[PDB]
Design an enzyme around this catalytic site. Sequence first.
Site, PDB file in Angstrom:
ATOM      1  N   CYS A  74      19.828 -17.830 -89.910  1.00 43.52           N
ATOM      2  CA  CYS A  74      19.417 -18.719 -88.820  1.00 43.52           C
ATOM      3  C   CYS A  74      17.997 -18.473 -88.327  1.00 43.52           C
ATOM      4  O   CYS A  74      17.208 -19.435 -88.298  1.00 43.52           O
ATOM      5  CB  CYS A  74      20.403 -18.619 -87.649  1.00 43.52           C
ATOM      6  N   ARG A  94      25.674  -7.188 -94.282  1.00 40.56           N
ATOM      7  CA  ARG A  94      26.211  -6.569 -93.076  1.00 40.56           C
ATOM      8  C   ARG A  94      26.727  -5.171 -93.410  1.00 40.56           C
ATOM      9  O   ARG A  94      27.206  -4.920 -94.524  1.00 40.56           O
ATOM     10  CB  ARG A  94      27.351  -7.403 -92.473  1.00 40.56           C
ATOM     11  N   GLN A 105      26.194 -17.293 -98.595  1.00 39.79           N
ATOM     12  CA  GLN A 105      26.997 -18.384 -98.064  1.00 39.79           C
ATOM     13  C   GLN A 105      26.258 -19.700 -98.201  1.00 39.79           C
ATOM     14  O   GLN A 105      25.023 -19.737 -98.199  1.00 39.79           O
ATOM     15  CB  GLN A 105      27.389 -18.195 -96.597  1.00 39.79           C
ATOM     16  N   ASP A 151      24.988 -21.830 -96.556  1.00 34.41           N
ATOM     17  CA  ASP A 151      24.521 -21.974 -95.195  1.00 34.41           C
ATOM     18  C   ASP A 151      23.709 -23.243 -95.019  1.00 34.41           C
ATOM     19  O   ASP A 151      23.062 -23.730 -95.952  1.00 34.41           O
ATOM     20  CB  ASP A 151      23.658 -20.787 -94.822  1.00 34.41           C
ATOM     21  N   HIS A 168      21.536 -25.351 -91.430  1.00 33.13           N
ATOM     22  CA  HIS A 168      21.324 -25.558 -90.005  1.00 33.13           C
ATOM     23  C   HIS A 168      20.725 -26.926 -89.770  1.00 33.13           C
ATOM     24  O   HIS A 168      19.737 -27.290 -90.416  1.00 33.13           O
ATOM     25  CB  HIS A 168      20.408 -24.501 -89.421  1.00 33.13           C
ATOM     26  N   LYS A 175      32.467 -24.716 -80.872  1.00 30.98           N
ATOM     27  CA  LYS A 175      32.614 -24.184 -82.214  1.00 30.98           C
ATOM     28  C   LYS A 175      33.884 -24.743 -82.825  1.00 30.98           C
ATOM     29  O   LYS A 175      34.892 -24.895 -82.135  1.00 30.98           O
ATOM     30  CB  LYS A 175      32.618 -22.657 -82.146  1.00 30.98           C
ATOM     31  N   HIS A 207      24.953 -24.872 -86.648  1.00 31.89           N
ATOM     32  CA  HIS A 207      25.171 -24.031 -87.818  1.00 31.89           C
ATOM     33  C   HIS A 207      26.422 -24.495 -88.539  1.00 31.89           C
ATOM     34  O   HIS A 207      27.455 -24.715 -87.906  1.00 31.89           O
ATOM     35  CB  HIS A 207      25.350 -22.558 -87.450  1.00 31.89           C
TER      36      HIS A 207
HETATM   37  C1  LIG Z   1      25.940 -17.650 -84.029  1.00 27.83           C
HETATM   38  O1  LIG Z   1      25.023 -17.499 -84.721  1.00 27.83           O
HETATM   39  C2  LIG Z   1      27.317 -17.632 -84.626  1.00 27.83           C
HETATM   40  N1  LIG Z   1      27.127 -18.262 -85.948  1.00 27.83           N
HETATM   41  C3  LIG Z   1      28.199 -18.591 -86.832  1.00 27.83           C
HETATM   42  O2  LIG Z   1      29.367 -18.365 -86.494  1.00 27.83           O
HETATM   43  C4  LIG Z   1      27.884 -19.293 -88.185  1.00 27.83           C
HETATM   44  C5  LIG Z   1      28.927 -19.856 -88.917  1.00 27.83           C
HETATM   45  C6  LIG Z   1      28.641 -20.546 -90.182  1.00 27.83           C
HETATM   46  C7  LIG Z   1      27.367 -20.673 -90.670  1.00 27.83           C
HETATM   47  C8  LIG Z   1      26.299 -20.112 -89.914  1.00 27.83           C
HETATM   48  O3  LIG Z   1      24.927 -20.213 -90.391  1.00 27.83           O
HETATM   49  C9  LIG Z   1      26.559 -19.439 -88.690  1.00 27.83           C
HETATM   50  O4  LIG Z   1      25.470 -18.932 -88.024  1.00 27.83           O
HETATM   51  C10 LIG Z   1      27.652 -16.121 -84.819  1.00 27.83           C
HETATM   52  O5  LIG Z   1      27.395 -15.454 -83.599  1.00 27.83           O
HETATM   53  C11 LIG Z   1      26.731 -15.624 -85.889  1.00 27.83           C
HETATM   54  C12 LIG Z   1      26.930 -14.133 -86.265  1.00 27.83           C
HETATM   55  C13 LIG Z   1      28.183 -13.596 -86.272  1.00 27.83           C
HETATM   56  C14 LIG Z   1      28.354 -12.227 -86.620  1.00 27.83           C
HETATM   57  C15 LIG Z   1      27.242 -11.436 -86.960  1.00 27.83           C
HETATM   58  N2  LIG Z   1      27.425 -10.007 -87.340  1.00 27.83           N
HETATM   59  O6  LIG Z   1      26.320  -9.280 -87.870  1.00 27.83           O
HETATM   60  O7  LIG Z   1      28.714  -9.366 -87.198  1.00 27.83           O
HETATM   61  C16 LIG Z   1      25.988 -12.000 -86.957  1.00 27.83           C
HETATM   62  C17 LIG Z   1      25.829 -13.348 -86.606  1.00 27.83           C
HETATM   63 ZN   LIG Z   2      23.691 -19.887 -88.613  1.00 22.95          ZN
END
Ligand SMILES: *C(=O)[C@@H](NC(=O)c1cccc(O)c1O)[C@H](O)Cc1ccc([N+](=O)[O-])cc1
Ligand SMILES: [Zn+2]
Lengths: 399, 399
Positions: free
Chosen positions: A93, A122, A140, A142, A144, A224, A270
Amino acid sequence: RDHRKIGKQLDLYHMQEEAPGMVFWHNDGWTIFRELEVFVRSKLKEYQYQEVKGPFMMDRVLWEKTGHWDNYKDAMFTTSSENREYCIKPMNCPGHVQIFNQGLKSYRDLPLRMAEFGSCHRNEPSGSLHGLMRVRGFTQDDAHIFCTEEQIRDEVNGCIRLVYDMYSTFGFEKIVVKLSTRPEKRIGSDEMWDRAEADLAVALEENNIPFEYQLGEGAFKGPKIEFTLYDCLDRAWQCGTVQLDFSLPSRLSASYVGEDNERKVPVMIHRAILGSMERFIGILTEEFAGFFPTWLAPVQVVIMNITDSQSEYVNELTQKLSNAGIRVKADLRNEKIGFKIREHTLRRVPYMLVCGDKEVESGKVAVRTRRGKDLGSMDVNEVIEKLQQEIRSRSLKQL
Amino acid sequence: RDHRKIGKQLDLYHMQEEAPGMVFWHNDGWTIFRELEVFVRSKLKEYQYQEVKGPFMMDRVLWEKTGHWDNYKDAMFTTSSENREYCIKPMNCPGHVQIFNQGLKSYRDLPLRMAEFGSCHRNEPSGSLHGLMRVRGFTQDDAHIFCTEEQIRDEVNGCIRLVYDMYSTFGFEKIVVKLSTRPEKRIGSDEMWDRAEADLAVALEENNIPFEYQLGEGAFKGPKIEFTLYDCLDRAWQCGTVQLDFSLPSRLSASYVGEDNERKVPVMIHRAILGSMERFIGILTEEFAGFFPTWLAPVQVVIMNITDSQSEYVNELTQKLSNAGIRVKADLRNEKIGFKIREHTLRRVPYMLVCGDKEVESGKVAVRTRRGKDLGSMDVNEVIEKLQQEIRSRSLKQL
Ligand SMILES: *C(=O)[C@@H](NC(=O)c1cccc(O)c1O)[C@H](O)Cc1ccc([N+](=O)[O-])cc1
Ligand SMILES: [Zn+2]
Ligand SMILES: *C(=O)[C@@H](NC(=O)c1cccc(O)c1O)[C@H](O)Cc1ccc([N+](=O)[O-])cc1
Ligand SMILES: [Zn+2]
């Protein structure tokens, strides 16, 4: 039906303690992965996404400006150089916002859909790691979407059709959708959250979607949506996420000129549809138990001779099929024809072409399938066109 | 002819101090990059390479076993997790050996050619960084060939044809080849180094290649070949490397069963043809000064109306071209036709289709090129077939 056992059996990938939670993609597993990318790209084209690639690490000070540093610093790998600390990206993001921030944006550029097959890492506890399902490094599908408030309904619509269109390609038609209950601590106006909720409500009604609410706390940054598919064993897999965001774009100083000539902040949506593709591949492996549909099969055809007489013919065929875009291999080894057929059947190769002496004299091939079905001798051009139709249509079933 | 200026001008990529030496690939720059991957893959298929993907970091203890840790530890980024130290990979070679080591290998599997578009990261001093040329994160058209001693001539042959076949696609036909003078400290028998040198000598003679020797010290692990291309400005660029290796496979415990039923160590041949693809893209940008050949052009066609009457027609065309596999965009803005034509010319879009009132009534389009050439009104199907031929042939020049 164990994706780790089938993975070893079909030489798809491996892992070792030297790189815990990180996939070594062998040729045949990489073939599946790349055939997923092509499929995702074909839908990117249809729904007009950009595709970008962002850097694999960025300054810590940037990550601190997202606000994710405080909440999730324990999950990010860190490294430094020249007394500067960087984070291996765990999400794509911030990078996409960086690309958006190059150059002046106006309302006429939105909605701006930006997709990336982004590799993220991660620092998951080593005890939670499991095969392709729970990993440390994943890619993923992904994307946005940057859009105005008024565009949320039309954009969410597009995400919804995308979810069902893609899942059905694989034979997943049972799908549960869960909305999220808004937290008490959240970012953005009360007014902003209720217009977006109407956009979400109207979009879900439009697609005739029965939604449940998720019993836990939602996200602080926006509404969400999560999509869960069910496989042939009636197991629930959560893959799709659509996450509205009113916090990141303001935090990273994104803006655009509206029709009123005012610098507004865009909304960020997202969305991933498959989620982690390493995980998704594991899911498909169990769904088909290794009998991958022809378009996903690492090797689609094996051509065999019965003695060395037909050996020159087979090599002709193998090249002829390969110019037609078919992943084909020639099996000219010194084994008997039943041995070759059983062996390539155990390896779940969809089609198997046998070339005996009559086959060469005739310009045709004997065709057996991996289910043991005998389709008889067919013209070579005939086998090619039929195979091409099955590939491009991504048919879940064979001839 | 400055790839950093043209890069900003054509919205190819950007960089920022937050991620020094790391490329943010915008949509149009990523389109070029991915069109290079497809080209490399098409030659991988021809010369029968596998394609794999390895993990982005691996245990430090592994890197210490290569022997590269001692020589080059200052260039590797390092991170840890759970009191274990990992290195972000600066080379793909150990990973490929890891994939080779899964499963028993015999002579019948060699030569085994393993290719990867591998992302690697080096900790280059920030002062040496320059645009796309000197970076910290890059992807190279990497490959490693595992083969017997007797296969070195035939394999090196294949690398040589590969170098000249690929470079010519871009219009690089002036090529200097430099052999390397063997160091005093080296790994492997004296006998092993002289048979390999005969294989290299015979392969270079076979391709009629005049070779110079490189005045500096060579590599300690084996004979090494470098290929330098010259561009239309007669500037020398070193891209291709073929590096024989007698040290890594023994150090990482690679082996195979020979015909004599003895566990021999395979020879490793490292080869890249373009080198870093980020760097290579910079080179092409300067070579063409932004007039990318049609197959590399980020946007290949723009279709324009003269008033809103023809607006529905243009959208028909844009979709029709897009189903034919052409990167096309419709320009329906409220600007006059000369303005659109000049603007898309400044952006080096190869072809430009104008739709006036006569064009709609006729089922044809008026075609202007980015060099200002007026090709007249042509049938729509005619423009499509001509454009497809130019794309698939990867013609360096237009109609
Ligand atoms: C906020 O960024 C939220 N994002 C998502 O759930 C998400 C879902 C599917 C595709 C994309 O690109 C998304 O950003 C969430 O807070 C993002 C997030 C979750 C966990 C961690 N972590 O390092 O455990 C980082 C970011
Ligand atoms: Zn995202
Ligand atoms: C030995 O590995 C030798 N390799 C190469 O020169 C090479 C050329 C082209 C393609 C591939 O895959 C190659 O491995 C060299 O010692 C490798 C190497 C050089 C420099 C650094 N560094 O971190 O400065 C690492 C490895
Ligand atoms: Zn190498």
